[PDB]
Amino acid sequence: ARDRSYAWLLSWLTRHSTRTQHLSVETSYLQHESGRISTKFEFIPSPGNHFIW
Amino acid sequence: MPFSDFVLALKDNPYFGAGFGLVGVGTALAMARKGAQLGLVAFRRHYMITLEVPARDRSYAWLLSWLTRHSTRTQHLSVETSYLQHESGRISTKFEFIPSPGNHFIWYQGKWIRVERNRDMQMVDLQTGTPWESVTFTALGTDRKVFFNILEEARALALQQ
Amino acid sequence: MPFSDFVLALKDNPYFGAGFGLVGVGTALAMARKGAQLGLVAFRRHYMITLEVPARDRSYAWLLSWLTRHSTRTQHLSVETSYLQHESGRISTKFEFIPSPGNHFIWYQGKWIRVERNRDMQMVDLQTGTPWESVTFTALGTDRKVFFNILEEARALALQQ
Amino acid sequence: EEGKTVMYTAVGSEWRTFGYPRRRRPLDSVVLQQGLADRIVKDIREFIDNPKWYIDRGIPYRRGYLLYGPPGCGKSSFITALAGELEHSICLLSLTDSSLSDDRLN
Amino acid sequence: YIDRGIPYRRGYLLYGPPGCGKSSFITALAGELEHSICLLSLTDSSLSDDRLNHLLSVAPQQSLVLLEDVDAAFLSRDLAVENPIKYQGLGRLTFSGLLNALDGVAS
Amino acid sequence: HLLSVAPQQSLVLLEDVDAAFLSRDLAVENPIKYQGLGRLTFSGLLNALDGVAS
Amino acid sequence: HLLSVAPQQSLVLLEDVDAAFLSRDLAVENPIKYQGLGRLTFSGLLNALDGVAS
Ligand SMILES: Nc1ncnc2c1ncn2[C@@H]1O[C@H](COP(=O)(O)OP(=O)(O)OP(=O)(O)O)[C@@H](O)[C@H]1O
Ligand SMILES: Nc1ncnc2c1ncn2[C@@H]1O[C@H](COP(=O)(O)OP(=O)(O)OP(=O)(O)O)[C@@H](O)[C@H]1O
Numbered sequence A: 001a002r003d004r005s006y007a008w009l010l011s012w013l014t015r016h017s018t019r020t021q022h023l024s025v026e027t028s029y030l031q032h033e034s035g036r037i038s039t040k041f042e043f044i045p046s047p048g049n050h051f052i053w
Numbered sequence B, C: 001m002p003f004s005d006f007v008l009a010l011k012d013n014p015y016f017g018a019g020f021g022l023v024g025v026g027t028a029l030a031m032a033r034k035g036a037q038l039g040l041v042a043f044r045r046h047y048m049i050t051l052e053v054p055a056r057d058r059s060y061a062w063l064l065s066w067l068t069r070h071s072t073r074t075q076h077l078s079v080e081t082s083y084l085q086h087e088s089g090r091i092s093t094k095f096e097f098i099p100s101p102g103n104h105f106i107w108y109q110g111k112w113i114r115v116e117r118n119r120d121m122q123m124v125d126l127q128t129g130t131p132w133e134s135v136t137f138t139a140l141g142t143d144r145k146v147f148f149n150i151l152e153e154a155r156a157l158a159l160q161q
Numbered sequence D: 001e002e003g004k005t006v007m008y009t010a011v012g013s014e015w016r017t018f019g020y021p022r023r024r025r026p027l028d029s030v031v032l033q034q035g036l037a038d039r040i041v042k043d044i045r046e047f048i049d050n051p052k053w054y055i056d057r058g059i060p061y062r063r064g065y066l067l068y069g070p071p072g073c074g075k076s077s078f079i080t081a082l083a084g085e086l087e088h089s090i091c092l093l094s095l096t097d098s099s100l101s102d103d104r105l106n
Numbered sequence E: 001y002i003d004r005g006i007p008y009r010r011g012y013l014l015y016g017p018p019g020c021g022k023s024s025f026i027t028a029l030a031g032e033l034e035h036s037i038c039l040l041s042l043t044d045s046s047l048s049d050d051r052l053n054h055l056l057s058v059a060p061q062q063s064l065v066l067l068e069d070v071d072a073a074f075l076s077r078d079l080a081v082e083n084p085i086k087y088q089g090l091g092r093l094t095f096s097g098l099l100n101a102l103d104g105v106a107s
Numbered sequence F, G: 001h002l003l004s005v006a007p008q009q010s011l012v013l014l015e016d017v018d019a020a021f022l023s024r025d026l027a028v029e030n031p032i033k034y035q036g037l038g039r040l041t042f043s044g045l046l047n048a049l050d051g052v053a054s
């Protein structure tokens, strides 16, 4: 976790996770182009064993 | 090759027959262990009522006081020393007993509750001396009103005396 | 298929009969282990008296002093060094023995109390040097007055000498 | 929580609810100088309803207010009444805290 | 109070030379009204503004919160005229914190 | 707490009370500063000796 | 405690007492301030050398 590569790889794993069904939630505020901000439900694969192709 | 040769090889050894029967024994034991877990889980979910009181609520103090009062003839008590002021104007030591940690059984409202004093685990908490002590009310049944009546009686007794 | 075929398959192997007999052995062993727990719990709840004294009460000091005095010929003691000021005016070393941690037996009022000096566990406590030491009074019987008499005698002896 | 006002507080580095939702104070129960409450409500409502005017000109979409006066004139009460009127929640912040730092404040 | 929007709170101040009967009268009144007394020490070391608000929010019902010797918590007179009302205590409490706790938005 | 759990039939002895706090000039001055080592205050001592919880 | 647990037939030695606390000007001044490092006070020393529990 001491490298920026950790953050980049975590982001890429969250994005390309196929249909992983062992995710964990992550709440963030997303600013819409209309000028308002709404809650954003983003899922990160929970710790465990995951398989990609 | 792995299919045909092994079956002939297994059939050659008469100990494999005893060994293969032992495989059924091992599978049955694993099945037996699994059956216990699901049965216990279902029994707890469908036929038991549980109420845990943490140390971070005033309800904990009220329920502890009510348990100290209504303890029947429990013989697993712990001492508690306090100074009591008599109406004469002087103060004398008060030997008060509180049920020591363990499994205690009560007969409130014709049931058999299994009140238990959870002990200190890691000495971490807030708003107290950090003992992380708790009490768990377990009983056989489905109605929740028993514990609600217990809590209301505890509050009434706290407002009493 | 799972019902009919397996019944024939298990019956085909004579080791299943030995194995299924072993299943009963496992079931009996689990029942025997559970039977011990319920018996112990019932015996403790119905025929034994327990009194725990933590180190956060002055009752702990009084009870410790009374145990040190009235220990009969206990041979599991621990040393405690102090200075005693003689009536002559000078002071000399005083060797006093306190029962060392362990299980000790007394014969107070015709019973056999099983006093036990609880040792330091995690070095956490308050109002003391944080050893978390305690004493447990275990005896066979139903009356509670024996422990109260012990506490009163301890207070009297503390007020004595 | 409708019909009431929720008040948050700084718990670590997040906003957490403080107590139970307080009951709303009616806006007319606060009597300020003639027309001041109307002006403030109009300003804040116009700011809320028009984010496009801010976005199309690049101005950051923020706004801040200052109420100053001798004690006992109705600042905190008016803030509570306005929060009730706009159905907003109040995030109490104590600048003179001990755990507050610049990064934590941001 | 409710029909007019006023907060349902109240406070009392008893001032005078020492030995005249402030604490005794407070105890007698608490006995008369069947209330309890919540002894709060402003000049403590573990007391902070958030803790003060929380304590004033969880006070037992039918109880009188008692702040005794309020003038000892913060400086006064010369320092009152001076811009900061310095907290002559041990904890992390400030004058604005006490003001908001006694009568603020979350009171 | 200490003054409330004093053993029965005992005399509590606060010896050399004058050293706990400043005096004279500072007594005339607005604050009675605690020139000690701990977290004790003049109001706390006054309440403990004779207050509501005494 | 240390003055109460000294070994028998021993001479407790407090060397250079004057360095423990301020003197002269501060002696005339109301507080006898402790010019040391620990949590020792003048009243405590006076009671330890000759007090009630000595
Ligand atoms: N215009 C007003 N209308 C109604 N009540 C008012 C008004 N001004 C003051 N009050 C009353 O004064 C009391 C306290 O008012 P408030 O807390 O708003 O005053 P403040 O001096 O602005 O506050 P703070 O000390 O938080 O800055 C409340 O009882 C409130 O009802
Ligand atoms: N009006 C009074 N009637 C009866 N006793 C009184 C009265 N005023 C003072 N006393 C007596 O004075 C003693 C202490 O009084 P009390 O603590 O109320 O005074 P105080 O100076 O207001 O206190 P504090 O220092 O706590 O503010 C008690 O013995 C009390 O009985």
Ligand SMILES: [Mg+2]
Residues within 6 Å of the ligand: D072, D074, D075, D076, D077
């Ligand atoms: Mg205000």
Ligand SMILES: [Mg+2]
Residues within 6 Å of the ligand: E021, E022, E023, E024
């Ligand atoms: Mg008084």
